[PDB]
């Protein structure tokens, strides 16, 4: 019942519209389109996979303005972001140009989608290390000093203590 995307588009008709959703695996599926109040169309998809999905929306075979759109899915209402924990120096303080490292423990949440975002005065390079011990290593490097926000989400819900505010100094 969540409208994964809504589009207000005048003087089209639903029977000539198509909404094709591509999942992260590359699988495509046809989304359900329903017309709400106004000419506001609700596009709904029941996802089998977590992560950002793409939707192409066409009227009479032509992309609408904005297409392709994307949307993210989750959470599922079953737990579970609250069972993930993250910690380490890279969530406390860092230095510009120097890998800021931390771990994420995801084993209690089980299967899903883990998103790591870093926001601030430069673009982060992010590294992921799968470990066979139930934990993930993450590292990021940012070029510019400043306050960064580091977000860790499971199925698009922030885990405990996310977002982390991280002061990044010039190296010393």
């Amino acid at each position: 019942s969540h409208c994964d995307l809504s589009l207000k588009i005048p003087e089209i008709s639903i029977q000539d519209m198509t909404a094709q959703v591509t999942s992260p695996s590359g699988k495509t599926h046809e989304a359900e389109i329903v017309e709400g109040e106004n000419h506001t169309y609700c596009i709904r998809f029941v996802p089998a996979e977590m992560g950002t999905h793409t939707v192409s929306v066409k009227y009479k075979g032509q992309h609408v303005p904005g297409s392709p759109f994307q949307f993210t899915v989750g959470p599922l209402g079953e737990g579970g972001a609250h069972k993930v924990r993250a910690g380490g120096p890279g969530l406390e303080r860092a230095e510009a140009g120097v890998p800021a490292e931390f771990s994420i423990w995801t084993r209690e949440a089980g299967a899903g989608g883990l998103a790591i975002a870093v926001e601030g005065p430069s673009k982060a390079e992010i590294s992921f290390e799968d470990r066979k011990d139930g934990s993930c290593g993450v590292a990021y490097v940012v070029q510019e000093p400043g306050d960064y926000e580091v977000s860790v989400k499971f199925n698009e819900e922030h885990i405990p203590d996310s977002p982390f505010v991280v002061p990044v100094a010039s190296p010393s």
């Binding site: 998103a115 975002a117 673009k123």
Partner: peptide
């Protein structure tokens, strides 16, 4: 004071 986003997603498998 410019602010940019960088984000990565990981598919987590059943344990």
């Amino acid at each position: 004071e410019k602010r940019v986003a960088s984000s990565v997603f990981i598919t987590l498998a059943p344990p």
